[PDB]
Symmetry: D2
Subunit: 534 residues, 4 copies
């Protein structure tokens, strides 16, 4: 609570220590779900893929290369210009852009369309045989709220969504029509186009890079490839070039991601767009790899490719100077960096059920169901703790005054009792805490047997009694509304959280299960709380 | 050059300043093409699209949303699952994936489609976590999309960047969608916000939740467009229909805000034509600074010997004063030997009445607003000299080196005398200076011009025996 | 609210449009302080200074220079090694590290200490004449909880804070003692030391940078300088160097901050640590400057300095090779970038009262004091709007049924009335909204006179009636607890927010004033709400 | 080299692959010191301290805290205003500012002090906003501080970096301080947290709020220290005493969390000695990769003519096969003319019985773990060749160039014959190869070693007439 700067200052100026110990008045008395870890801050988290893409950008920029956006969708004519003959071999592993035509409301489906009851479903409205032609002319998506909500009456799409379904079975015959447009397999396809417009107008050497998407087709399998991937690519345009330049770049580039040693082999493919005997395969050794559940135990992994563009394809775009091209594949580099083994599990994790809450996050989700509402009750429970926490080994029966005060304007006095005998006031597991560990919620007592759980897991700080106390603290305040005179709340054995006042939102509950987690909250809690609210 | 600690150490004990000035000895002597600005470092430069994208990731992260990558290639059955009965209207604007049939030609379209907007993949991604993770769920993703809207190039393009995000809680107003827009949009300058319900009323958005955010950015007021009032529609958002969520088993509602990147990118870096922005390499838009054009202007033939340098260095040293004396009139500038034989340098305007050096001996080359000029430093050209990048290379300077290296060719050719002369200056070659053939095709492309003209009228005779 | 995926799916599969319009059931009915802009997200913001420092780092790294941390506190002996004689001239503008000695509990203050009542304040405890010597030997701050809470009893520092004040008036005589340690004026001082250890062990050329603090003394004035500043510095070690290298770096460096043209002049100082005739002053032209409330209307501003280190000082550290040194001063570069005119106002803004809330942030802070609590009341007010919003021009008197329902289990019926006559049901300013504009809160009605305020400011969305309605909506629910039978809440004129149910936290209120803001909420609201809660 | 679009364009119309292979013609021919890895790009590298600092700024910003710069130089009257009666105990560990008195010598201490921790400046900064801005106030700042703790160097230093933050609200528990620690600390790997009340009970923190955060980081378990259990005290925090706030007029409480940077920096990049981290330039810690050492190993004298290259290029081409034939025995390798006169190259081991080339003609130079070795590629050295960076320069290779350039000196010296010979290899000069004098002082400093020894035993005679 806010205090008075003056007062606290004119009192401390004379008597300090007295003002000090007084500070405690400004703190806040938090209820039960107002304490750590029941309260916390949240922060956003990046995705390994996008992360690496960023690192990758900087990396490049840090070595001279300037950023650029290349043509993604291109006419396969370009590919056939970059492979001459071996072109087809590629276009098989590429994707073509197909697209739905328009409802041919003429000729073929027109003659036989004019030999039946043109229209029965009363709609009238002058022959809009032109408002339908402007469709076979040039329409789109946001154009339906024109030939309905402004044509045959009826708001937006309340009748337009079915008028085009019942009276127009036509639409349900459209079929996407392939074309010559393609989704570039690799970056290179677009480089020729872009380098085309500037290979000789800007000063040499030219250093350009671009980390963007590319689409490929390789045995429709999420495992053995993905339809789309990222390719951190670059091009080096200069008068004189050698495969060395390809290495020098590959080095300086990888070196900013750990890799400490590189080896370059000559690629067998010997692709057409690259000069003969320049398509190199670059291998880099990175520590994080040494000895792993992978095939790169020795640390070495092939991380990129590169070569010089054949003065052939270059001419196909009238590029006079030779050009170096390195092509780091992102997804891998990301796995190595962020430690993932399965491409698909890394990039698309939510889908592969790779979600996970932490011990601490689960502990934070375990709230207290029945919790007081009046400053009094907060003390009633706080107190029920004292007497029940101390007089735990009292050969029952036996009452014990816990609280003495006025609640809501009525004399209140609650006691901690026990009915049976030959036992103790409170059961043995009265001081059992809820510790989350290895993903399972537990209701155990501190021991030399449970250590592993209190030093590795994360304790919730709530003990059965601490949980119950709050339940009782509620009942008593209830009677303070029903103006009764005697409430004796009692709890026997514990089988779950419910039998402890604790609970967790349904979603965290489902998580636990989905994750093969386990909740274990049982034990003799036994401890009734007879109240005498006059 | 590497000096000696001790030597200089002790040398400083006697007379300090005599040793201090002694320091100038370690400084390297620079040739003409070795000093600023004919030498300079370089560095990468990011693209405004991408920059804005990263700038958007942080923005999102800064308001709590964690990143995720959504499906890009999808079976249209999804668009259908979401839009309900409006699904077909949409499938029009979307692309489809077609492949070539293996000839054991003509692409065979398939059921796959490139997402027309993030929302297509959202339902798919939220399907696996919506009821397993603790609420609220705040996810976002800035990735590529594919629309066919008229299949245009001018107005819009085939692929854009969506700056999407989704909020999954038990209770959601249209307000959460309002807050998220301001928090996100404010981190870019936008000061005032206005929302208007969208007429499109897309069927995947609970009826009457779909809104359109209008933001005010002072960077716009006065703009050469209809965004002068400062406001611009910058993003849309709505709340997913239970009809669609149900289709994927999402029990709780979901707020979805979408940000049109290329637009923001434009607002930020101030481009008018998206294409001229996202794709300037093609749309002729390419620039070099005057400072850059400058650096590229270099001395062609330059003295290849230690002496050669101190030769032309003198040639000028005299013209810088005797470029007056009524011609004819001869002056001596150098006295020494190179390679093996003694040498002397002469400078005179053999011709009749006039001055020794032409009226352009003191013309400096400077680049300005894209053109390469050859002009005298007169109180008339000031602005060219105070807004451009003066090469530092003057007519006589450009000339000298030519001679100082030309006599150097006779000195090794056994010859005894050479008469290097120079009258007018039709261009640069005439002033002994060049620019890589590429900056040249550049100047022209950027329809700039080179005006290096001038009556140098200066000849140099040298005798080596 | 969460719904059922099945139901909403098996109903939509058959009947769509019907399911659609049904969705609205899952949205949330927000109260009044649950609406925009009364609700919002918050995000952290960077400080121009630290910002530029970051940009600066990247900038450097982007041109080859590797990061390093240099000696901050150094023996002035170094300075005298870098200026030879002109050293003193510098050490005057530098700071020396002074430090409090120890309470000389011996000799001078010992003899006369043993001629009085050594100790009267009963404390006993064996002569700890050694526990006090270990102080004149080597003690610190966290050592008081040893010779009190573990010596003469008494917890932590309840008696230690005064026992050292009353019985020990000594301590109050300590005086910081100067030394030879200094806080480097500029980075250069530390470069010699660091370059010392590697100028010849690493490969040339060496490129190092460091953006760190430095302290200077210049006429104790916050305006004409500051005690501490930042200096983005770098050093270029190589065999052959020329002032050109200083320019080339200055260029490539500034070029990443806009500046498009540079001019370098020779510095008059002609400092000793720099070779004679190399200390250059670098001037750069940056657009953001063209025409401004500053002295840089022409766009040019002097942003950095640089020169070669005299082979003299270099030897003083046995550095064989020459070395280039550029020194961009941060604070300025930051002002130019983030547009600030006054150093002090920029770096230290909170202190110079340069705080500021926005129109939108103020609008967000205007909450509604009296707000309902039961789903019923929310409708009562919602309704009081309808009847009062429509029947606004009804020549009073005249009742108007607004709500008919059961609240908390009691028949409730409230009406919108008026007592006087010759007027209308609701006052003229009943539909006045609270628009924040130019920093002043306003209670005005939409007009062709107020446009400027509704299109430039930010409307709160609350109108007097909308405000009142919620007050009334509360009163009626109150009687539903006092089981009365008739409450007739009435509001006359409005003078402030209070007379409208609106309010703002005390801090935003003080902000307004401190900022010379103005609240204007007046006008004839007149509109009573007689309730008949049976 | 720049080719001709058309030429190659048409050339491809006939036989494609014949034109494709024709492409190899544009590739530049590289000299010995021009190919990898004797040529490579470089790039800046940030310092772990700073990195961590930035990494900390974002972390703070990501949990909502806005940045601010606090006063650094201050009048001790503040330390006093805050610590109340404990104020002096503190003033001990703090520094004071002293200046030189203008002689119209001996520094004159003053009342100014360099802040011992952020908190000193916090109260000052919060003083102006605590009651004017809307709550909660969340500020943070990562700046420099000055402590005198024993005035040590080993254990600690004179200046450290505090990663401070403050939370100003009407109600604050010790919990807010707990949450902020986890949110902040988690963004670095810390998984489990443990808090323990601090005994120090500093008087500026409400009695019994001052805590000490203990965080668990898997990156530690197994560490060669007492942080093996994985946990480490990583930060402290408390709630400002009303006694102190009052002194500055702050009505509401304030939570303050402090993060010891140099420590975090260490945990992250794994340094053990703070000084060896923050100040490695001094503490001898400086490294070069084998790949770097490599690049620095270059051919000293190399053929300065087009032919020269194809000469040594042949010299080796023969030794690569005839390094067997029982000596004496002579072979011819080159046949052509350079500069003007025809030339032929001879290779023979004049001496008696043995082989032509010594047993070290095929020794490649490779760098490994810091040493520069000269070794044969035998199934015995593998690891050196598969974990190090093989120069690619072999004994014969290193040799050849020497000769191919040595006959080049006779070819221009008018001479008629030269006999370049070579027996043992005591080092690199002997193999015609060098390393900048600085990498040399390096190898030694990093007490590494160079073992380039070997019996080359190969001589080359050449006759030009």
């Amino acid at each position: 609570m806010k205090f008075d700067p003056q007062k606290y200052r004119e009192l401390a100026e004379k008597d300090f220590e007295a003002a000090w110990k007084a500070g405690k008045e400004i703190l806040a008395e938090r209820s039960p779900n107002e304490l750590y870890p029941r309260v916390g801050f949240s922060f956003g988290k990046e995705h390994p893929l996008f992360a690496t893409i960023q690192r990758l950008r900087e990396a490049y920029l840090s070595i001279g290369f300037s950023e650029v956006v290349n043509p993604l969708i291109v006419e396969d004519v370009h590919v056939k210009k970059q492979f001459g003959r071996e072109a087809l071999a590629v276009l098989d592993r590429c994707f073509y852009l197909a697209t739905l035509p328009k409802p041919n409301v003429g000729i073929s489906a027109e003659k036989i369309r004019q030999i039946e009851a043109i229209t029965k479903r009363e709609v009238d409205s002058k022959p809009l045989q032109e408002i339908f032609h402007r469709y076979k002319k040039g329409e789109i998506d946001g154009d339906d709220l024109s030939y309905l909500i402004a044509e045959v009456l009826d708001v937006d799409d309340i009748t337009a969504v079915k008028i085009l379904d019942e009276v127009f079975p036509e639409f349900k015959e459209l079929k996407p029509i392939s074309s010559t447009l393609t989704l570039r397999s690799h970056m290179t396809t677009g480089w020729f186009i872009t380098l085309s417009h500037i290979a000789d107008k800007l000063p040499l050497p030219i250093k350009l890079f671009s980390i963007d998407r590319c689409f490929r087709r390789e045995q429709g399998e999420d495992a053995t490839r993905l339809y789309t991937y990222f390719s951190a690519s670059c091009v080096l345009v200069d008068e004189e070039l050698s495969v060395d330049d390809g290495k020098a770049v590959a080095e300086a580039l990888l070196r900013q991601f750990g890799f400490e040693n590189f080896r370059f082999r000559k690629d067998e493919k010997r692709s057409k767009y690259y000069i003969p005997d320049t398509q190199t395969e670059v291998f880099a050794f990175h520590p994080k790899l040494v000895g792993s559940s992978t095939k790169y135990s020795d640390g070495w992994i092939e991380i990129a490719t590169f070569g010089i563009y054949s003065p052939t394809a270059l001419a196909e775009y009238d590029i006079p100077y030779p050009v170096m091209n390195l092509g780091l594949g992102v997804e891998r580099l990301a796995m190595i960096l962020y430690g993932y083994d399965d491409v698909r599990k890394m990039v698309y994790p939510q889908i592969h059920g790779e979600i996970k809450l932490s011990d601490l996050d689960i502990a934070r989700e375990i709230k207290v169901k029945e919790v007081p509402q009046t400053a009094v009750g907060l003390k009633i429970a706080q107190s029920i703790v004292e007497t029940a926490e101390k007089h735990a080994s009292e050969p029952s029966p036996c009452s014990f005054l816990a609280f003495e005060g006025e609640m809501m304007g009525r004399n209140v006095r609650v006691y901690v009792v026990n009915e049976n005998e030959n036992t103790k006031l409170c059961g043995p597991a009265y001081a059992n805490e809820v510790v989350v560990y290895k993903g399972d919620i537990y209701g155990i007592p501190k021991t030399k047997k449970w250590r592993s759980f209190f030093e590795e897991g994360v304790p919730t700080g709530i003990r059965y009694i601490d949980g119950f106390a709050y339940y009782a603290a509620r009942k008593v305040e209830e009677a303070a509304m029903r103006e009764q005179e005697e409430v004796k709340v009692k709890a026997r054995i514990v089988e779950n959280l419910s039998d402890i006042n604790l609970y967790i939102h349904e979603n965290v509950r489902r998580y636990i299960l989905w994750k093969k987690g386990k909740i274990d909250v049982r034990g003799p809690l036994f401890v009734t709380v007879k109240a005498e609210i006059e």
